[PDB]
RNA sequence: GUGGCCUAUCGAUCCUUUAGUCCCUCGGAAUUUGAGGCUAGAGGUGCCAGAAAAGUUACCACAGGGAUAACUGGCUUGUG
RNA sequence: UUGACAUUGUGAAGAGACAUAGAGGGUGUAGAAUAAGUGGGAGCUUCGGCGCCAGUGAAAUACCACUACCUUUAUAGUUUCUUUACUUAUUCAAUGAAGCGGAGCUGGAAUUCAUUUUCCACGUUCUAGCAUUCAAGGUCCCAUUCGGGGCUGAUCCGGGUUGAAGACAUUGUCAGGUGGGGAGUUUGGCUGGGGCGGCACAUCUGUUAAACGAUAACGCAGAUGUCCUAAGGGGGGCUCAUG
RNA sequence: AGAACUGGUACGGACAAGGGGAAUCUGACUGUCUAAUUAAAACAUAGCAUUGCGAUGGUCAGAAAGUGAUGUUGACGCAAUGUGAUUUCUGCCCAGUGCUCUGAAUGUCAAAGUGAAGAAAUUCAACCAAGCGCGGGUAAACGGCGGGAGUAACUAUGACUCUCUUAAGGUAGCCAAAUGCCUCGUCAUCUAAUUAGUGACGCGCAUGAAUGGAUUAACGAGAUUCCCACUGUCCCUAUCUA
RNA sequence: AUGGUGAACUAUGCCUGAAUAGGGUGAAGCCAGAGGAAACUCUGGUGGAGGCUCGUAGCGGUUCUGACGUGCAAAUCGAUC
RNA sequence: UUGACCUCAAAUCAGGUAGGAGUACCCGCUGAACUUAAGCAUAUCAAUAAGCGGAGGAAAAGAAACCAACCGGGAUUGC
C-alpha cells in the first residue's frame, strides 16, 4: 500500500520515512519489484539495483524479467546529451511523436533524478569528454588513453556506466 | 462427440514420420576416454545443409578406435570454418576458434554445440539440458554451472559436455517477415503439421464454450486451467500477464 | 347454580427425539445394555380428519387437430 | 492433485509445544508490602499463631474454585520435521561391459621439521596429405623352420565399464474438493402460445428493512393464536345516556 | 515497313474471341468445402500480440506398463486461441465473474495414528495435508468506457467545487529567410561607397490544408445506382427452315 | 445398449509416377552511348523473373432460373462465366 | 600349477505332450440397455441377452467345523 498511495510532499516525507524503513528474502523482493514497477510507471536506480539483485539470484519474479526483456542505453545516450549540455531540446527530441515536434515547437522544466535536476538548473542559470566519446562508441580507446595519461586512484582502478555513476 | 482440434494426437497416421527430406539424427557416436576430460578432436568437411530449416550439417565420420570402420555420421556443422578444419580442443593444450570443451574447463563466454547435458554418455537418457554450445558464462564453483538465457529461465547443472564452438545462420530468418507468401503446407510438411491455428466465429456454433454465437465476441475466459479438465483445453493455459513489449530497451 | 341473555370456544400418518410399565423381544438353554411395538408429547405444511413437481435449446424425424384442449385486453376503441 | 500405515532396513540422530500430581514471580499511584476483573467474611487440627490487630482507605492480607501461566526438569514413549558414506529389492541409454576410479615401480611445479599424511598426470591438436591385421624391438621352446605356443609390452583388486539418483519414484482398496470429454435423467397449466432477474401475499407502533413508495417471514425484546384471578353465580337496594 | 493498280466506299469477309468507363458500403488478390436447393461479407495464407516451456517438466491418445506421435526438434524449434496486406492499429481504470500463485497456513479441516470413561459396542475434544477465505498481476481473454477524487451518517443520498482529450457561428502556422522570376524599386540598420548581408508589411509564378466530430490503390462469378454506344423487350402484331 | 465386420467413390497425412495450346505487360543483375567533381540520374537490346493478366483440356458447376423430373440421368445435355 | 554333488542351458534319436469346430444341458470369472415405475436416482428386469476359454460323456455340488431343542439327528441333487 506504500507505493500504492505513494503514487506527494507528505509523500516523500513519510516516503523516505518508511523508505529507509523497508530499506535475502524475495517476497519483499518482488514486492519492491511491482513497487518500482508502477513507480517508473507513473528504486529506479534502486530499481535496476534489485534488478542485478535477482540477476545474481514461474510467477512474478519471472514475468517481471520477461517484461524487462520484452539509465541503461538510454543512460549512455542522454549521457552524451547532458554531456555537451553542461558543456538541448533538439538532442532530447532526437533521443525520444507528433508531440515530439509539438515540443520541437520552466515549461520543459516540469516537463521532463539528481542528474536531471542539476542539468535543468544549470541550463536555466545559463539561459571526461574522453568518457564521452567512449560510451559513445580502438581509435576511441586511442584518444581514450590519450587524454588518459594526458580520486584518480579509484579512477585508474559499461564499466564506464558504473563510472559515470560514481562521477 | 464433437471434439476440438487439440485432441487429435491419438491415431498414428497424420502425425507420424513426414520427413523423407531429411537424413539422420545429430547425437554423437560411441563415447570413450577421449570424448571427455583429456583430449577430443572433431572434424567437418562436407557441410551439407540441414534439411527442413536453416542450418549446416557435416559428415563427421570418426575412424572407430575399436574396429576398422568409418560409419558415415551426419552431425551438426558450424559457420566460420571452410571445407575442412579439424578441431584444436585440448584440455592439457590450449584453446582457439571453434573448439569442443566441457562447461568447466573454460571461462565465461563459451557458445558450444548441442549434444547432451549429462557428464557424457552418447545422448544422455535425458535432454532437459542446453540446446548446444549456446552458453555464456559458467561457474568455477566445483562441477556446478549456472547458465542463463534471455528466454527467462535459470538452470544449475554439471560442467561436462561435448559441444563445439560455432554459429548457425538462423538469426535474421525469423527477423525478416515471410514476404512472398504461399507457406503453410510445404511449410510444415516437415515433421508433422501445426500451423492451422484456426478460427471461425461460427466454426462450431450450438457449442462454443469460449463464447461466440452469431457475433464476434467471446464469453468464458480462454485461460484453461492446467489441472482441472483435459477436455476443455482450447486456447490459453495458465495465464498471468498481458502487455506490449516496445522496441526501446535501455532497462535496468 | 356441568359458566357469561343468545351467537364466537379444532393442530394427520410415516421418519427423528423424549418420558412412562419391570412386562414383551432377547429367534444355540440361561444372564447383563440393546435399533424395531402398545400408551402418552413436541416439531415440518391454517389446500378444512387440514400430503402438489421444476425454472437453458426454432439444430431433425414419426405418430396428430375445425372446441389451436390451454380459463375476461401484452395494442387501437361505437351514439362527442 | 493431497495424506497415514504397509511395501522397506537401521537408531551414534541439531533445535520445540503435550496427554496425572508438588515449590519458584503475580511488583500501576498511595499504604514500608505479593489489595491480580468477580465471589466467599464465622472458619479448618481447637492448649497455643491469624479470627476484625493500629496509620491510610473505592477494593485489606489462612481457607475446597471459572486463571490470562515470563523461564526449566520430569518413568515405559511420541504422527509429520534438513542431514555425508556403506544399500543382495524397482526403473535404466549404450551393450562388440573399450583402455575407468582408489591403491601401486616413477617426473615437474609450490616451501623446509624429516616423506610423500594432500591437489593437475595415464597414445590424434597447422591442412580429407598420412594411419589396422595375435603392435616395430628383447628373454624363454619341437632344430637350424617361408609357421605356431607363455610372460613383459598391456602388472592387480573391484565385476557397481565412460554417465542421473536413491531405502528416492511408479501400481491397488482409502472423507471431501478441480472437470458436461462421455453416458443417463430432467420440460402440467401461469400476460388469447411462449418471450429479464429475484420470488420480500395475511398480525398496532419502533426495530427487523440498504432513508420522502412499497415491502412478507409459526425470527429477536413486553404483551399477543383478542378480553377475565370476579365483568362468575345468588339476595336486597337503586333505575341509565342525550336534550 | 514503305511506294502502285483494281471492285460492291469492298478490307481479322465463315469459324475462334475481354461490351466498356466513372462512385459508396463490405472485403486484400491467388487456393479449398457444403456428393443432391445456399460459391458468400466464412475459413486459410503474409504481419502483429498474449499464455505455456530446463528432460526427475508439460500437452495428446489408451484399461495399464518397460506401448506410440509431438521428438531426424533445443529458446532459431516445439502445442493450443484470437486477429488476417502495408499506412492506420487502447486516453484512463483491476472492486465483481476466470486463470496463475516460489505472496499469506492453524478460522475450518475426514480416516488411520494419538488422548478419557468403559469387562464392551455406539458416540467421541484437540493436532495435520489439500481445497475454500484474503491480496496482487492479467480485460489485443470475456466487461465497463459523458472517466478517475475530496467533502459533520459508523456503512445507505452524491448537491456544490476542482482536474482531464465533457466548450455550436470556421481566426491552424511560416512568409525578400536556401524556397520572391518579376526586383540593382519602398521602409529600417551600417557606410565615402557596397547590385551582397540583417530587420516589417503586401497579391506566395513553384510553401502548408498540424491538431478535430466514424481512412484506401490494384484485383473481382458478392450487392445497389448512373451515363455513352448498341438493341423489334415493350409500344404492337405477323411470316420462314431443320 | 451389447456382440462383429470394410477404404475401388469422397475427405486428410506420408511415400512411389505420368501429364499441363498459343501471347501481351518485361522485375534484379550485366553490356553500349550521353550528362555530372563525387556518393549518381535515363533511353535503346539480351536475359523472362511472378502465390500475375487473357484463354482450351484437366480441375471447377455461379449466371441464361430452359428442356426433363408417373425416376432419358437414384441429379443430365447445350450455351455462358 | 590339477578330477565330483546342487542351481542355471543347448538337438533333426527311442519313448511323450501342446494350439480347435460342433456344442442341448451344466460350471468358474468379468460385464449393459429397453418394459413397469402416485415425476427423476434406489430398486425390479438381472448373479440376464450376446461373446470367450477349459474339463467331462452327464456337469456342478455332495460321505459333515452340516441340520435341531426333539421321540436326539444319519451324505448330495431334483419332482
Curated annotation (Swiss-Prot), chain A:
It is found in: Nucleus, Nucleolus. Residues 106-124 have a biased composition (Acidic residues). Residues 88-96 have a biased composition (Basic and acidic residues). It comes from the Eukaryota. Associated with the 60S pre-ribosomal particles. Interacts with NAP1. Belongs to the SDA1 family. Present with 3640 molecules/cell in log phase SD medium. Required for 60S pre-ribosomal subunits export to the cytoplasm. May also be required for 60S ribosomal subunit maturation and accumulation. Involved in G1 events and passage through start, and possibly actin cytoskeleton organization. This is Protein SDA1. It comes from Saccharomyces cerevisiae (strain ATCC 204508 / S288c).
Curated annotation (Swiss-Prot), chain B:
The modification Phosphoserine is found at residues 51, 94, 158-159, 248. The keyword Ubl conjugation applies. It comes from Saccharomyces cerevisiae (strain ATCC 204508 / S288c) (Baker's yeast). This is Large ribosomal subunit protein uL2A. One of its GO terms (molecular function) is RNA binding. Pfam families: Ribosomal_L2, Ribosomal_L2_C. InterPro entries: NA-bd_OB-fold, Rib_uL2_dom2, Ribosomal_uL2, Ribosomal_uL2_C, Ribosomal_uL2_CS, Ribosomal_uL2_dom3, Ribosomal_uL2_RNA-bd_dom, Translation_prot_SH3-like_sf. Component of the large ribosomal subunit (LSU). Mature yeast ribosomes consist of a small (40S) and a large (60S) subunit. The 40S small subunit contains 1 molecule of ribosomal RNA (18S rRNA) and 33 different proteins (encoded by 57 genes). The large 60S subunit contains 3 rRNA molecules (25S, 5.8S and 5S rRNA) and 46 different proteins (encoded by 81 genes). It comes from the Eukaryota.
Amino acid at each position: 500500500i506504500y507505493t500504492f498511495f505513494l503514487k506527494q510532499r507528505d509523500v516523500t516525507r513519510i516516503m523516505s520515512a518508511c523508505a529507509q524503513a523497508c530499506h535475502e528474502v524475495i517476497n519483499v523482493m518482488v514486492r519492491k519489484i511491482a513497487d518500482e514497477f508502477v513507480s517508473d510507471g507513473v528504486v529506479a536506480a534502486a530499481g535496476i539495483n534489485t534488478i542485478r539483485e535477482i540477476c545474481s539470484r514461474d510467477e512474478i519474479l519471472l514475468q517481471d524479467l520477461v517484461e524487462y526483456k520484452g539509465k541503461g542505453v538510454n543512460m549512455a545516450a542522454k549521457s552524451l546529451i547532458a554531456l555537451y549540455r553542461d558543456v538541448q531540446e533538439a538532442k532530447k527530441g532526437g533521443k525520444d511523436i507528433e508531440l515530439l515536434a509539438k515540443w520541437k515547437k520552466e515549461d520543459a522544466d516540469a516537463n521532463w533524478v539528481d542528474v536531471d535536476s542539476e542539468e535543468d538548473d544549470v541550463d536555466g542559470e545559463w539561459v571526461p569528454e574522453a568518457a564521452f566519446r567512449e560510451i559513445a562508441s580502438a581509435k576511441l580507446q586511442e584518444l581514450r588513453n590519450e587524454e588518459s595519461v594526458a580520486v584518480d586512484a579509484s579512477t585508474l582502478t559499461e564499466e564506464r556506466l558504473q563510472k559515470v555513476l560514481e562521477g | 462427440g464433437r471434439v476440438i482440434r487439440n485432441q487429435r494426437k491419438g491415431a498414428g497416421s497424420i502425425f507420424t514420420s513426414h520427413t523423407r527430406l531429411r537424413q539422420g539424427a545429430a547425437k554423437l557416436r560411441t563415447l570413450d576416454y577421449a570424448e571427455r576430460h583429456g583430449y577430443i578432436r572433431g572434424i567437418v568437411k562436407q557441410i551439407v545443409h540441414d534439411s527442413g530449416r536453416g542450418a549446416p550439417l557435416a559428415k563427421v565420420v570418426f575412424r572407430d578406435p575399436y574396429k576398422y570402420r568409418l560409419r558415415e555420421e551426419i552431425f551438426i556443422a558450424n559457420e566460420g570454418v571452410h571445407t575442412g578444419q579439424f578441431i584444436y580442443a585440448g584440455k592439457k593444450a590450449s584453446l582457439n576458434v571453434g573448439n569442443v570443451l566441457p562447461l568447466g574447463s573454460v571461462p565465461e563466454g563459451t557458445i558450444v554445440s548441442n549434444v547432451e547435458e549429462k557428464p557424457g554418455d552418447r545422448g544422455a537418457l535425458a535432454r532437459a539440458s542446453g540446446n548446444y554450445v549456446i552458453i555464456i558464462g559458467h561457474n568455477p564453483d566445483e562441477n556446478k554451472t549456472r547458465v542463463r538465457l534471455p528466454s527467462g529461465a535459470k538452470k544449475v547443472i554439471s560442467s561436462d559436455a561435448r559441444g563445439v564452438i560455432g554459429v548457425i545462420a538462423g538469426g535474421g530468418r525469423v527477423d525478416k517477415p515471410l514476404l512472398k507468401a504461399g507457406r503453410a503446407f510445404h511449410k510444415y510438411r516437415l515433421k508433422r503439421n501445426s500451423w492451422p491455428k484456426t478460427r471461425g466465429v461460427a466454426m462450431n456454433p450450438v457449442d462454443h464454450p469460449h463464447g461466440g454465437g452469431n457475433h464476434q465476441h467471446i464469453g468464458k475466459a480462454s485461460t484453461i486451467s492446467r489441472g482441472a479438465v483435459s477436455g476443455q483445453k482450447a486456447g490459453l493455459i495458465a495465464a498471468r500477464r498481458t502487455g506490449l513489449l516496445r522496441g526501446s530497451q535501455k532497462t535496468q
